[PDB]
Specification:
By secondary structure, this protein is mainly alpha-helical. It has one domain: NK-Lysin. Helix content is 70%, strand content 0%. It is built from 4 helices and no strands. The protein is globular. The structure holds calcium ion. The site of calcium ion (CA) has 2 residues, from loops. This is Saposin-A.
Length: 82
């Protein structure tokens, strides 16, 4: 998906790191949404926030299982080429 794929992978990486830091699921949601502001253009930051809102909760459920790396997780969600 290019951008949606790139964003998905950054999200999965960040979520995993925060979970290890004992962050709550809401703190992760709040933080990734704010990190989306690092994307240089308003439209890109906006699409990043929608991906975070739409996928972070399911990503948290997925990574509690056997699959936890960005590539494998984002390919499963079909945000990155299978
Ligand atoms: Ca900024």
């Amino acid at each position: 998906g290019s951008l949606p794929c790139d964003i998905c992978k950054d999200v999965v990486t960040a979520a995993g790191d925060m979970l290890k830091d004992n962050a709550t699921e809401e703190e992760i949601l709040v933080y990734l949404e704010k990190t989306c502001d690092w994307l240089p253009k308003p439209n890109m930051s906006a699409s990043c926030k929608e991906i975070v809102d739409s996928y972070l909760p399911v990503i948290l459920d997925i990574i509690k299982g056997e699959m936890s790396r960005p590539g494998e997780v984002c390919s499963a969600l079909n945000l990155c080429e299978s």
